[PDB]
Design a protein around this ligand. Sequence first.
Ligand SMILES: [Mg+2]
Length: 315
Amino acid sequence: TGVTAVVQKVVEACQDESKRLDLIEIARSYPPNQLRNMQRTFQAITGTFLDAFLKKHLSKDFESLVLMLYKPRAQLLCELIRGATKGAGTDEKCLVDVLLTIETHEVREIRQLYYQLYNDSLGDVVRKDCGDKYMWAKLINAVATGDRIPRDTHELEEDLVLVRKAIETKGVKKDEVSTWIRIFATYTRADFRQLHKMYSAKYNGDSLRAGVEDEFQGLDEYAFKLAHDFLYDPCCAAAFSMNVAFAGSGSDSNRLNRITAMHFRECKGCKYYYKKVYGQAFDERCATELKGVYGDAIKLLWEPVTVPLLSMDDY
Ligand SMILES: [Mg+2]
């Protein structure tokens, strides 16, 4: 039903703790543009801005999640890139998570919106935020400014030999930087999946992904694994990033929030791939790592929607 009912449901969800997950049900039930229109009309209807309302009632982690959900992906990605320098350091992890998981069809609208919102170029902003020293920064710069274009069996055969050589040498040699960056930053999904298969066919079952582990450590290693998994299959990349956010003693809520908010609408296989890859059900890991409404929110967002979306305009 219509905007009135949705705004009332939002208000009742903040005022009654048993209704908190209604905020998530709303995120999962309407197209992002309609949720954006709702949030943009919420202050005009109620007298109070949405975030102000949410902060009175919700935990920081849960309100932070909700505030990423009521907008299209392009808007969310621009705000996350901008916010990566809200401190006076750079959130490198956030920039890597974002720049490496943008589909080709989305790139132009995002670059345009970024300039439109903040009147700087996204490429310039990324280059300024990250420099060009580290492999992860070289990789995201090449993605931020570049394009992914098709190739023939011929170039893939040559690159196979080059990437095997890079994998085989200790350290990232001078002449190898070009190899890593060209493949991971400029291949299409189709060609990347072909190269992946050709590699294991040529090298007795060895994998490209295992090679990344050989060559890189720390954030380099995460960034190259993330680009690999995204190019191979986005639900793989989503499962991998969520598994990393859970790693160690506690968990990274800000990363759990953005990975979930950036990807939950596109990636229906995440929980399934998670279980396949890690051997533990996503919800079971969630149950150990997270508690209360915030935990249930993350599990619920990642649950594949199986019915058609509502329309707020259908009134
Ligand atoms: Mg090497």
